[PDB]
mmCIF file with all atom_site columns, C-alpha atoms in Angstrom:
data_model
loop_
_atom_site.group_PDB
_atom_site.id
_atom_site.type_symbol
_atom_site.label_atom_id
_atom_site.label_alt_id
_atom_site.label_comp_id
_atom_site.label_asym_id
_atom_site.label_entity_id
_atom_site.label_seq_id
_atom_site.pdbx_PDB_ins_code
_atom_site.Cartn_x
_atom_site.Cartn_y
_atom_site.Cartn_z
_atom_site.occupancy
_atom_site.B_iso_or_equiv
_atom_site.pdbx_formal_charge
_atom_site.auth_seq_id
_atom_site.auth_comp_id
_atom_site.auth_asym_id
_atom_site.auth_atom_id
_atom_site.pdbx_PDB_model_num
ATOM 1   C CA . UNK A 1 1   ? -6.901  -37.379 -65.437 1.00 0.00 ? 1   UNK A CA 1
ATOM 2   C CA . UNK A 1 2   ? -6.053  -40.549 -63.525 1.00 0.00 ? 2   UNK A CA 1
ATOM 3   C CA . UNK A 1 3   ? -4.547  -39.045 -60.414 1.00 0.00 ? 3   UNK A CA 1
ATOM 4   C CA . UNK A 1 4   ? -7.664  -36.824 -60.468 1.00 0.00 ? 4   UNK A CA 1
ATOM 5   C CA . UNK A 1 5   ? -10.777 -36.629 -58.295 1.00 0.00 ? 5   UNK A CA 1
ATOM 6   C CA . UNK A 1 6   ? -14.137 -35.631 -59.706 1.00 0.00 ? 6   UNK A CA 1
ATOM 7   C CA . UNK A 1 7   ? -15.906 -33.480 -57.157 1.00 0.00 ? 7   UNK A CA 1
ATOM 8   C CA . UNK A 1 8   ? -19.682 -33.466 -56.830 1.00 0.00 ? 8   UNK A CA 1
ATOM 9   C CA . UNK A 1 9   ? -22.147 -31.656 -59.058 1.00 0.00 ? 9   UNK A CA 1
ATOM 10  C CA . UNK A 1 10  ? -22.900 -28.495 -57.061 1.00 0.00 ? 10  UNK A CA 1
ATOM 11  C CA . UNK A 1 11  ? -25.312 -25.561 -56.932 1.00 0.00 ? 11  UNK A CA 1
ATOM 12  C CA . UNK A 1 12  ? -23.828 -22.863 -59.185 1.00 0.00 ? 12  UNK A CA 1
ATOM 13  C CA . UNK A 1 13  ? -23.421 -19.200 -58.179 1.00 0.00 ? 13  UNK A CA 1
ATOM 14  C CA . UNK A 1 14  ? -24.640 -16.697 -60.761 1.00 0.00 ? 14  UNK A CA 1
ATOM 15  C CA . UNK A 1 15  ? -21.072 -15.344 -61.340 1.00 0.00 ? 15  UNK A CA 1
ATOM 16  C CA . UNK A 1 16  ? -20.692 -11.560 -61.752 1.00 0.00 ? 16  UNK A CA 1
ATOM 17  C CA . UNK A 1 17  ? -19.211 -10.296 -65.065 1.00 0.00 ? 17  UNK A CA 1
ATOM 18  C CA . UNK A 1 18  ? -18.569 -6.456  -65.152 1.00 0.00 ? 18  UNK A CA 1
ATOM 19  C CA . UNK A 1 19  ? -18.507 -6.647  -68.898 1.00 0.00 ? 19  UNK A CA 1
ATOM 20  C CA . UNK A 1 20  ? -22.188 -6.485  -69.890 1.00 0.00 ? 20  UNK A CA 1
ATOM 21  C CA . UNK A 1 21  ? -21.563 -8.397  -73.063 1.00 0.00 ? 21  UNK A CA 1
ATOM 22  C CA . UNK A 1 22  ? -19.886 -11.153 -71.094 1.00 0.00 ? 22  UNK A CA 1
ATOM 23  C CA . UNK A 1 23  ? -22.820 -11.211 -68.678 1.00 0.00 ? 23  UNK A CA 1
ATOM 24  C CA . UNK A 1 24  ? -25.278 -11.485 -71.551 1.00 0.00 ? 24  UNK A CA 1
ATOM 25  C CA . UNK A 1 25  ? -23.331 -14.209 -73.338 1.00 0.00 ? 25  UNK A CA 1
ATOM 26  C CA . UNK A 1 26  ? -22.912 -16.119 -70.116 1.00 0.00 ? 26  UNK A CA 1
ATOM 27  C CA . UNK A 1 27  ? -26.638 -15.965 -69.344 1.00 0.00 ? 27  UNK A CA 1
ATOM 28  C CA . UNK A 1 28  ? -27.574 -16.881 -72.916 1.00 0.00 ? 28  UNK A CA 1
ATOM 29  C CA . UNK A 1 29  ? -25.232 -19.932 -73.069 1.00 0.00 ? 29  UNK A CA 1
ATOM 30  C CA . UNK A 1 30  ? -25.016 -20.802 -69.350 1.00 0.00 ? 30  UNK A CA 1
ATOM 31  C CA . UNK A 1 31  ? -25.567 -24.611 -69.806 1.00 0.00 ? 31  UNK A CA 1
ATOM 32  C CA . UNK A 1 32  ? -22.295 -24.985 -71.850 1.00 0.00 ? 32  UNK A CA 1
ATOM 33  C CA . UNK A 1 33  ? -20.019 -24.379 -68.850 1.00 0.00 ? 33  UNK A CA 1
ATOM 34  C CA . UNK A 1 34  ? -18.945 -27.207 -66.503 1.00 0.00 ? 34  UNK A CA 1
ATOM 35  C CA . UNK A 1 35  ? -21.121 -28.461 -63.527 1.00 0.00 ? 35  UNK A CA 1
ATOM 36  C CA . UNK A 1 36  ? -18.463 -30.423 -61.696 1.00 0.00 ? 36  UNK A CA 1
ATOM 37  C CA . UNK A 1 37  ? -14.735 -29.898 -61.295 1.00 0.00 ? 37  UNK A CA 1
ATOM 38  C CA . UNK A 1 38  ? -11.693 -32.156 -61.378 1.00 0.00 ? 38  UNK A CA 1
ATOM 39  C CA . UNK A 1 39  ? -8.899  -31.743 -58.828 1.00 0.00 ? 39  UNK A CA 1
ATOM 40  C CA . UNK A 1 40  ? -6.059  -33.496 -57.027 1.00 0.00 ? 40  UNK A CA 1
ATOM 41  C CA . UNK A 1 41  ? -6.503  -34.400 -53.334 1.00 0.00 ? 41  UNK A CA 1
ATOM 42  C CA . UNK A 1 42  ? -5.992  -31.384 -51.081 1.00 0.00 ? 42  UNK A CA 1
ATOM 43  C CA . UNK A 1 43  ? -3.012  -32.883 -49.125 1.00 0.00 ? 43  UNK A CA 1
ATOM 44  C CA . UNK A 1 44  ? -0.941  -32.278 -52.264 1.00 0.00 ? 44  UNK A CA 1
ATOM 45  C CA . UNK A 1 45  ? -1.334  -28.470 -51.945 1.00 0.00 ? 45  UNK A CA 1
ATOM 46  C CA . UNK A 1 46  ? 0.308   -25.994 -49.597 1.00 0.00 ? 46  UNK A CA 1
ATOM 47  C CA . UNK A 1 47  ? -2.424  -23.400 -50.174 1.00 0.00 ? 47  UNK A CA 1
ATOM 48  C CA . UNK A 1 48  ? -5.726  -22.562 -51.882 1.00 0.00 ? 48  UNK A CA 1
ATOM 49  C CA . UNK A 1 49  ? -4.146  -20.837 -54.886 1.00 0.00 ? 49  UNK A CA 1
ATOM 50  C CA . UNK A 1 50  ? -1.974  -23.844 -55.866 1.00 0.00 ? 50  UNK A CA 1
ATOM 51  C CA . UNK A 1 51  ? -5.121  -25.950 -55.724 1.00 0.00 ? 51  UNK A CA 1
ATOM 52  C CA . UNK A 1 52  ? -7.378  -23.555 -57.587 1.00 0.00 ? 52  UNK A CA 1
ATOM 53  C CA . UNK A 1 53  ? -4.879  -22.952 -60.430 1.00 0.00 ? 53  UNK A CA 1
ATOM 54  C CA . UNK A 1 54  ? -4.588  -26.712 -60.857 1.00 0.00 ? 54  UNK A CA 1
ATOM 55  C CA . UNK A 1 55  ? -8.317  -27.464 -60.625 1.00 0.00 ? 55  UNK A CA 1
ATOM 56  C CA . UNK A 1 56  ? -9.042  -24.677 -63.118 1.00 0.00 ? 56  UNK A CA 1
ATOM 57  C CA . UNK A 1 57  ? -6.404  -25.896 -65.579 1.00 0.00 ? 57  UNK A CA 1
ATOM 58  C CA . UNK A 1 58  ? -7.518  -29.549 -65.380 1.00 0.00 ? 58  UNK A CA 1
ATOM 59  C CA . UNK A 1 59  ? -11.214 -28.696 -65.522 1.00 0.00 ? 59  UNK A CA 1
ATOM 60  C CA . UNK A 1 60  ? -11.053 -26.416 -68.503 1.00 0.00 ? 60  UNK A CA 1
ATOM 61  C CA . UNK A 1 61  ? -8.783  -28.923 -70.240 1.00 0.00 ? 61  UNK A CA 1
ATOM 62  C CA . UNK A 1 62  ? -11.145 -31.769 -69.740 1.00 0.00 ? 62  UNK A CA 1
ATOM 63  C CA . UNK A 1 63  ? -14.175 -29.736 -70.787 1.00 0.00 ? 63  UNK A CA 1
ATOM 64  C CA . UNK A 1 64  ? -12.588 -28.220 -73.880 1.00 0.00 ? 64  UNK A CA 1
ATOM 65  C CA . UNK A 1 65  ? -11.309 -31.623 -75.043 1.00 0.00 ? 65  UNK A CA 1
ATOM 66  C CA . UNK A 1 66  ? -14.767 -33.189 -74.579 1.00 0.00 ? 66  UNK A CA 1
ATOM 67  C CA . UNK A 1 67  ? -16.292 -30.365 -76.554 1.00 0.00 ? 67  UNK A CA 1
ATOM 68  C CA . UNK A 1 68  ? -13.719 -30.294 -79.347 1.00 0.00 ? 68  UNK A CA 1
ATOM 69  C CA . UNK A 1 69  ? -13.851 -34.078 -79.983 1.00 0.00 ? 69  UNK A CA 1
ATOM 70  C CA . UNK A 1 70  ? -17.727 -33.824 -80.331 1.00 0.00 ? 70  UNK A CA 1
ATOM 71  C CA . UNK A 1 71  ? -17.001 -31.449 -83.193 1.00 0.00 ? 71  UNK A CA 1
ATOM 72  C CA . UNK A 1 72  ? -18.155 -28.267 -81.338 1.00 0.00 ? 72  UNK A CA 1
ATOM 73  C CA . UNK A 1 73  ? -16.248 -25.116 -80.309 1.00 0.00 ? 73  UNK A CA 1
ATOM 74  C CA . UNK A 1 74  ? -15.682 -22.402 -77.650 1.00 0.00 ? 74  UNK A CA 1
ATOM 75  C CA . UNK A 1 75  ? -15.133 -18.729 -78.532 1.00 0.00 ? 75  UNK A CA 1
ATOM 76  C CA . UNK A 1 76  ? -12.702 -16.511 -76.739 1.00 0.00 ? 76  UNK A CA 1
ATOM 77  C CA . UNK A 1 77  ? -15.699 -15.135 -74.724 1.00 0.00 ? 77  UNK A CA 1
ATOM 78  C CA . UNK A 1 78  ? -16.778 -18.720 -73.843 1.00 0.00 ? 78  UNK A CA 1
ATOM 79  C CA . UNK A 1 79  ? -13.197 -19.311 -72.502 1.00 0.00 ? 79  UNK A CA 1
ATOM 80  C CA . UNK A 1 80  ? -13.068 -16.230 -70.308 1.00 0.00 ? 80  UNK A CA 1
ATOM 81  C CA . UNK A 1 81  ? -16.512 -17.014 -68.903 1.00 0.00 ? 81  UNK A CA 1
ATOM 82  C CA . UNK A 1 82  ? -15.579 -20.648 -68.201 1.00 0.00 ? 82  UNK A CA 1
ATOM 83  C CA . UNK A 1 83  ? -12.360 -19.966 -66.348 1.00 0.00 ? 83  UNK A CA 1
ATOM 84  C CA . UNK A 1 84  ? -14.351 -17.735 -63.986 1.00 0.00 ? 84  UNK A CA 1
ATOM 85  C CA . UNK A 1 85  ? -17.288 -20.147 -63.674 1.00 0.00 ? 85  UNK A CA 1
ATOM 86  C CA . UNK A 1 86  ? -14.758 -22.972 -62.965 1.00 0.00 ? 86  UNK A CA 1
ATOM 87  C CA . UNK A 1 87  ? -12.658 -20.774 -60.738 1.00 0.00 ? 87  UNK A CA 1
ATOM 88  C CA . UNK A 1 88  ? -15.498 -20.108 -58.240 1.00 0.00 ? 88  UNK A CA 1
ATOM 89  C CA . UNK A 1 89  ? -16.363 -23.805 -58.118 1.00 0.00 ? 89  UNK A CA 1
ATOM 90  C CA . UNK A 1 90  ? -12.743 -24.751 -57.412 1.00 0.00 ? 90  UNK A CA 1
ATOM 91  C CA . UNK A 1 91  ? -12.578 -22.306 -54.453 1.00 0.00 ? 91  UNK A CA 1
ATOM 92  C CA . UNK A 1 92  ? -15.722 -23.833 -53.005 1.00 0.00 ? 92  UNK A CA 1
ATOM 93  C CA . UNK A 1 93  ? -14.113 -27.274 -53.449 1.00 0.00 ? 93  UNK A CA 1
ATOM 94  C CA . UNK A 1 94  ? -10.875 -26.232 -51.784 1.00 0.00 ? 94  UNK A CA 1
ATOM 95  C CA . UNK A 1 95  ? -12.758 -24.944 -48.738 1.00 0.00 ? 95  UNK A CA 1
ATOM 96  C CA . UNK A 1 96  ? -14.774 -28.190 -48.437 1.00 0.00 ? 96  UNK A CA 1
ATOM 97  C CA . UNK A 1 97  ? -11.769 -30.425 -49.066 1.00 0.00 ? 97  UNK A CA 1
ATOM 98  C CA . UNK A 1 98  ? -9.313  -28.379 -47.077 1.00 0.00 ? 98  UNK A CA 1
ATOM 99  C CA . UNK A 1 99  ? -11.460 -28.346 -43.966 1.00 0.00 ? 99  UNK A CA 1
ATOM 100 C CA . UNK A 1 100 ? -12.687 -31.952 -44.251 1.00 0.00 ? 100 UNK A CA 1
ATOM 101 C CA . UNK A 1 101 ? -8.958  -32.791 -44.429 1.00 0.00 ? 101 UNK A CA 1
ATOM 102 C CA . UNK A 1 102 ? -7.834  -30.501 -41.571 1.00 0.00 ? 102 UNK A CA 1
ATOM 103 C CA . UNK A 1 103 ? -10.766 -31.597 -39.365 1.00 0.00 ? 103 UNK A CA 1
ATOM 104 C CA . UNK A 1 104 ? -9.290  -33.207 -36.246 1.00 0.00 ? 104 UNK A CA 1
ATOM 105 C CA . UNK A 1 105 ? -12.239 -35.156 -34.729 1.00 0.00 ? 105 UNK A CA 1
ATOM 106 C CA . UNK A 1 106 ? -11.410 -37.720 -32.093 1.00 0.00 ? 106 UNK A CA 1
ATOM 107 C CA . UNK B 2 1   ? -0.594  -19.774 -67.751 1.00 0.00 ? 1   UNK B CA 1
ATOM 108 C CA . UNK B 2 2   ? 1.095   -17.002 -65.779 1.00 0.00 ? 2   UNK B CA 1
ATOM 109 C CA . UNK B 2 3   ? 3.171   -19.068 -63.406 1.00 0.00 ? 3   UNK B CA 1
ATOM 110 C CA . UNK B 2 4   ? 4.181   -20.959 -66.577 1.00 0.00 ? 4   UNK B CA 1
ATOM 111 C CA . UNK B 2 5   ? 7.403   -21.171 -68.584 1.00 0.00 ? 5   UNK B CA 1
ATOM 112 C CA . UNK B 2 6   ? 7.393   -21.639 -72.332 1.00 0.00 ? 6   UNK B CA 1
ATOM 113 C CA . UNK B 2 7   ? 10.228  -23.958 -73.248 1.00 0.00 ? 7   UNK B CA 1
ATOM 114 C CA . UNK B 2 8   ? 12.059  -23.667 -76.555 1.00 0.00 ? 8   UNK B CA 1
ATOM 115 C CA . UNK B 2 9   ? 10.867  -24.902 -79.926 1.00 0.00 ? 9   UNK B CA 1
ATOM 116 C CA . UNK B 2 10  ? 12.694  -28.232 -80.280 1.00 0.00 ? 10  UNK B CA 1
ATOM 117 C CA . UNK B 2 11  ? 13.518  -30.917 -82.840 1.00 0.00 ? 11  UNK B CA 1
ATOM 118 C CA . UNK B 2 12  ? 10.615  -33.392 -82.759 1.00 0.00 ? 12  UNK B CA 1
ATOM 119 C CA . UNK B 2 13  ? 11.023  -37.183 -82.517 1.00 0.00 ? 13  UNK B CA 1
ATOM 120 C CA . UNK B 2 14  ? 8.938   -39.167 -84.994 1.00 0.00 ? 14  UNK B CA 1
ATOM 121 C CA . UNK B 2 15  ? 6.835   -40.751 -82.170 1.00 0.00 ? 15  UNK B CA 1
ATOM 122 C CA . UNK B 2 16  ? 5.954   -44.455 -82.526 1.00 0.00 ? 16  UNK B CA 1
ATOM 123 C CA . UNK B 2 17  ? 2.224   -45.366 -82.659 1.00 0.00 ? 17  UNK B CA 1
ATOM 124 C CA . UNK B 2 18  ? 1.525   -49.197 -82.658 1.00 0.00 ? 18  UNK B CA 1
ATOM 125 C CA . UNK B 2 19  ? -1.886  -48.481 -84.041 1.00 0.00 ? 19  UNK B CA 1
ATOM 126 C CA . UNK B 2 20  ? -1.307  -48.156 -87.799 1.00 0.00 ? 20  UNK B CA 1
ATOM 127 C CA . UNK B 2 21  ? -4.267  -45.878 -88.201 1.00 0.00 ? 21  UNK B CA 1
ATOM 128 C CA . UNK B 2 22  ? -2.902  -43.599 -85.512 1.00 0.00 ? 22  UNK B CA 1
ATOM 129 C CA . UNK B 2 23  ? 0.492   -43.613 -87.224 1.00 0.00 ? 23  UNK B CA 1
ATOM 130 C CA . UNK B 2 24  ? -1.095  -42.704 -90.544 1.00 0.00 ? 24  UNK B CA 1
ATOM 131 C CA . UNK B 2 25  ? -3.257  -39.947 -89.086 1.00 0.00 ? 25  UNK B CA 1
ATOM 132 C CA . UNK B 2 26  ? -0.321  -38.563 -87.170 1.00 0.00 ? 26  UNK B CA 1
ATOM 133 C CA . UNK B 2 27  ? 1.881   -38.478 -90.277 1.00 0.00 ? 27  UNK B CA 1
ATOM 134 C CA . UNK B 2 28  ? -0.901  -36.978 -92.397 1.00 0.00 ? 28  UNK B CA 1
ATOM 135 C CA . UNK B 2 29  ? -1.707  -34.168 -89.892 1.00 0.00 ? 29  UNK B CA 1
ATOM 136 C CA . UNK B 2 30  ? 1.667   -33.862 -88.115 1.00 0.00 ? 30  UNK B CA 1
ATOM 137 C CA . UNK B 2 31  ? 1.831   -29.992 -88.251 1.00 0.00 ? 31  UNK B CA 1
ATOM 138 C CA . UNK B 2 32  ? -1.322  -29.637 -86.024 1.00 0.00 ? 32  UNK B CA 1
ATOM 139 C CA . UNK B 2 33  ? 0.424   -30.874 -82.867 1.00 0.00 ? 33  UNK B CA 1
ATOM 140 C CA . UNK B 2 34  ? 2.384   -28.523 -80.568 1.00 0.00 ? 34  UNK B CA 1
ATOM 141 C CA . UNK B 2 35  ? 6.090   -27.509 -81.200 1.00 0.00 ? 35  UNK B CA 1
ATOM 142 C CA . UNK B 2 36  ? 6.857   -26.084 -77.787 1.00 0.00 ? 36  UNK B CA 1
ATOM 143 C CA . UNK B 2 37  ? 5.658   -27.006 -74.316 1.00 0.00 ? 37  UNK B CA 1
ATOM 144 C CA . UNK B 2 38  ? 4.557   -25.053 -71.262 1.00 0.00 ? 38  UNK B CA 1
ATOM 145 C CA . UNK B 2 39  ? 5.700   -26.085 -67.782 1.00 0.00 ? 39  UNK B CA 1
ATOM 146 C CA . UNK B 2 40  ? 6.346   -24.879 -64.245 1.00 0.00 ? 40  UNK B CA 1
ATOM 147 C CA . UNK B 2 41  ? 9.968   -24.474 -63.073 1.00 0.00 ? 41  UNK B CA 1
ATOM 148 C CA . UNK B 2 42  ? 11.526  -27.814 -62.156 1.00 0.00 ? 42  UNK B CA 1
ATOM 149 C CA . UNK B 2 43  ? 12.233  -26.894 -58.467 1.00 0.00 ? 43  UNK B CA 1
ATOM 150 C CA . UNK B 2 44  ? 8.482   -27.236 -57.901 1.00 0.00 ? 44  UNK B CA 1
ATOM 151 C CA . UNK B 2 45  ? 8.577   -30.996 -58.677 1.00 0.00 ? 45  UNK B CA 1
ATOM 152 C CA . UNK B 2 46  ? 9.813   -33.924 -56.618 1.00 0.00 ? 46  UNK B CA 1
ATOM 153 C CA . UNK B 2 47  ? 10.157  -36.144 -59.697 1.00 0.00 ? 47  UNK B CA 1
ATOM 154 C CA . UNK B 2 48  ? 9.868   -36.418 -63.487 1.00 0.00 ? 48  UNK B CA 1
ATOM 155 C CA . UNK B 2 49  ? 6.335   -37.836 -63.474 1.00 0.00 ? 49  UNK B CA 1
ATOM 156 C CA . UNK B 2 50  ? 4.842   -34.936 -61.454 1.00 0.00 ? 50  UNK B CA 1
ATOM 157 C CA . UNK B 2 51  ? 6.447   -32.587 -63.959 1.00 0.00 ? 51  UNK B CA 1
ATOM 158 C CA . UNK B 2 52  ? 5.447   -34.472 -67.082 1.00 0.00 ? 52  UNK B CA 1
ATOM 159 C CA . UNK B 2 53  ? 1.791   -34.892 -66.010 1.00 0.00 ? 53  UNK B CA 1
ATOM 160 C CA . UNK B 2 54  ? 1.635   -31.154 -65.376 1.00 0.00 ? 54  UNK B CA 1
ATOM 161 C CA . UNK B 2 55  ? 3.432   -30.098 -68.568 1.00 0.00 ? 55  UNK B CA 1
ATOM 162 C CA . UNK B 2 56  ? 1.201   -32.421 -70.601 1.00 0.00 ? 56  UNK B CA 1
ATOM 163 C CA . UNK B 2 57  ? -1.995  -31.115 -68.994 1.00 0.00 ? 57  UNK B CA 1
ATOM 164 C CA . UNK B 2 58  ? -1.021  -27.440 -69.407 1.00 0.00 ? 58  UNK B CA 1
ATOM 165 C CA . UNK B 2 59  ? 0.273   -27.916 -72.943 1.00 0.00 ? 59  UNK B CA 1
ATOM 166 C CA . UNK B 2 60  ? -2.715  -29.752 -74.290 1.00 0.00 ? 60  UNK B CA 1
ATOM 167 C CA . UNK B 2 61  ? -4.983  -27.245 -72.550 1.00 0.00 ? 61  UNK B CA 1
ATOM 168 C CA . UNK B 2 62  ? -3.303  -24.292 -74.095 1.00 0.00 ? 62  UNK B CA 1
ATOM 169 C CA . UNK B 2 63  ? -3.213  -25.864 -77.549 1.00 0.00 ? 63  UNK B CA 1
ATOM 170 C CA . UNK B 2 64  ? -6.810  -27.064 -77.535 1.00 0.00 ? 64  UNK B CA 1
ATOM 171 C CA . UNK B 2 65  ? -8.070  -23.664 -76.342 1.00 0.00 ? 65  UNK B CA 1
ATOM 172 C CA . UNK B 2 66  ? -6.097  -21.865 -79.080 1.00 0.00 ? 66  UNK B CA 1
ATOM 173 C CA . UNK B 2 67  ? -7.536  -24.224 -81.643 1.00 0.00 ? 67  UNK B CA 1
ATOM 174 C CA . UNK B 2 68  ? -11.126 -24.135 -80.409 1.00 0.00 ? 68  UNK B CA 1
ATOM 175 C CA . UNK B 2 69  ? -11.299 -20.303 -80.238 1.00 0.00 ? 69  UNK B CA 1
ATOM 176 C CA . UNK B 2 70  ? -10.063 -20.143 -83.933 1.00 0.00 ? 70  UNK B CA 1
ATOM 177 C CA . UNK B 2 71  ? -13.181 -22.142 -84.734 1.00 0.00 ? 71  UNK B CA 1
ATOM 178 C CA . UNK B 2 72  ? -11.322 -25.435 -85.510 1.00 0.00 ? 72  UNK B CA 1
ATOM 179 C CA . UNK B 2 73  ? -11.455 -28.864 -83.823 1.00 0.00 ? 73  UNK B CA 1
ATOM 180 C CA . UNK B 2 74  ? -9.522  -31.971 -82.654 1.00 0.00 ? 74  UNK B CA 1
ATOM 181 C CA . UNK B 2 75  ? -10.889 -35.516 -83.025 1.00 0.00 ? 75  UNK B CA 1
ATOM 182 C CA . UNK B 2 76  ? -10.454 -38.183 -80.429 1.00 0.00 ? 76  UNK B CA 1
ATOM 183 C CA . UNK B 2 77  ? -7.533  -39.547 -82.560 1.00 0.00 ? 77  UNK B CA 1
ATOM 184 C CA . UNK B 2 78  ? -5.960  -36.040 -82.684 1.00 0.00 ? 78  UNK B CA 1
ATOM 185 C CA . UNK B 2 79  ? -6.140  -35.983 -78.820 1.00 0.00 ? 79  UNK B CA 1
ATOM 186 C CA . UNK B 2 80  ? -4.486  -39.343 -78.282 1.00 0.00 ? 80  UNK B CA 1
ATOM 187 C CA . UNK B 2 81  ? -1.736  -38.451 -80.751 1.00 0.00 ? 81  UNK B CA 1
ATOM 188 C CA . UNK B 2 82  ? -1.138  -35.057 -79.109 1.00 0.00 ? 82  UNK B CA 1
ATOM 189 C CA . UNK B 2 83  ? -0.826  -36.294 -75.554 1.00 0.00 ? 83  UNK B CA 1
ATOM 190 C CA . UNK B 2 84  ? 1.922   -38.643 -76.757 1.00 0.00 ? 84  UNK B CA 1
ATOM 191 C CA . UNK B 2 85  ? 3.624   -36.037 -78.960 1.00 0.00 ? 85  UNK B CA 1
ATOM 192 C CA . UNK B 2 86  ? 3.504   -33.591 -75.980 1.00 0.00 ? 86  UNK B CA 1
ATOM 193 C CA . UNK B 2 87  ? 4.470   -36.270 -73.513 1.00 0.00 ? 87  UNK B CA 1
ATOM 194 C CA . UNK B 2 88  ? 7.832   -37.018 -75.210 1.00 0.00 ? 88  UNK B CA 1
ATOM 195 C CA . UNK B 2 89  ? 8.640   -33.312 -75.421 1.00 0.00 ? 89  UNK B CA 1
ATOM 196 C CA . UNK B 2 90  ? 7.898   -32.818 -71.719 1.00 0.00 ? 90  UNK B CA 1
ATOM 197 C CA . UNK B 2 91  ? 10.292  -35.665 -70.759 1.00 0.00 ? 91  UNK B CA 1
ATOM 198 C CA . UNK B 2 92  ? 13.028  -34.074 -72.832 1.00 0.00 ? 92  UNK B CA 1
ATOM 199 C CA . UNK B 2 93  ? 12.292  -30.770 -71.052 1.00 0.00 ? 93  UNK B CA 1
ATOM 200 C CA . UNK B 2 94  ? 12.392  -32.336 -67.605 1.00 0.00 ? 94  UNK B CA 1
ATOM 201 C CA . UNK B 2 95  ? 15.806  -33.864 -68.307 1.00 0.00 ? 95  UNK B CA 1
ATOM 202 C CA . UNK B 2 96  ? 17.201  -30.521 -69.559 1.00 0.00 ? 96  UNK B CA 1
ATOM 203 C CA . UNK B 2 97  ? 15.617  -28.509 -66.755 1.00 0.00 ? 97  UNK B CA 1
ATOM 204 C CA . UNK B 2 98  ? 16.236  -31.037 -64.035 1.00 0.00 ? 98  UNK B CA 1
ATOM 205 C CA . UNK B 2 99  ? 19.933  -31.314 -64.772 1.00 0.00 ? 99  UNK B CA 1
ATOM 206 C CA . UNK B 2 100 ? 20.509  -27.605 -65.485 1.00 0.00 ? 100 UNK B CA 1
ATOM 207 C CA . UNK B 2 101 ? 18.909  -27.101 -62.045 1.00 0.00 ? 101 UNK B CA 1
ATOM 208 C CA . UNK B 2 102 ? 20.837  -29.870 -60.231 1.00 0.00 ? 102 UNK B CA 1
ATOM 209 C CA . UNK B 2 103 ? 24.136  -28.831 -61.875 1.00 0.00 ? 103 UNK B CA 1
ATOM 210 C CA . UNK B 2 104 ? 26.521  -27.828 -59.082 1.00 0.00 ? 104 UNK B CA 1
ATOM 211 C CA . UNK B 2 105 ? 29.280  -25.849 -60.890 1.00 0.00 ? 105 UNK B CA 1
ATOM 212 C CA . UNK B 2 106 ? 31.578  -23.775 -58.738 1.00 0.00 ? 106 UNK B CA 1
#
C-alpha cells in the first residue's frame, strides 16, 4: 500500500447471494464491508482478471488489518461476503480505469 | 489464493527490530507470525521487488484472515512485526525461485 491507488467511494450494488443465510447476514451487517477499493494503475495489467484478483487481495487485506488492529473480527461468513462485495467494486473500477486509460482523444 | 503457490516451511531468521519494544514483543509472541509464504510463480515478475510486494501482501492477507475468522486479533505492533518477518522470507523465496527458474542446465 504505497504503489497503490485508492479509488473513489462509489454507489454499492446490492450483491446477490444464493445462500439465504449469506444474504441475511450481509443485509444485517452491510456497513462492515468496504466502500472504496485499492488497486494498482491499470497500465500494469494485461486484462481485467489480473486487475480484479489484485484489487480484491489488496482491498480485503487492508480492510481486515484495519479491523483486526481495532480489536474487532470477521467471521468466515463475513469473509465470503466481503470478497464478493469487493469483487464487484473492483470490476467497476477496472472498466472505468481501463477505458479512461484506453481513451484516445485528440 | 488459487493462482498461488505455497512455498516450503523454512528456517526463520531472528529479524532485527531497532525499536526495543518491537524486539521484545516479537520475541515474546514469535510463534504467531507466519512460517511459510504464498506467492505467484517467479516468471510473472520482472524483478525481486514486484515479487516481494506481492508475496508480502498475499501472505499477510491470508494469515490475518485465518486469525480473524478464529476469533483472534493482531495489534498494530503485531502487523509491523509480521510484514518484516514475512518480507525476509519472501526475499529468500525470490532468490530460490528466481535462480531455480533462470538456471540453464543442459
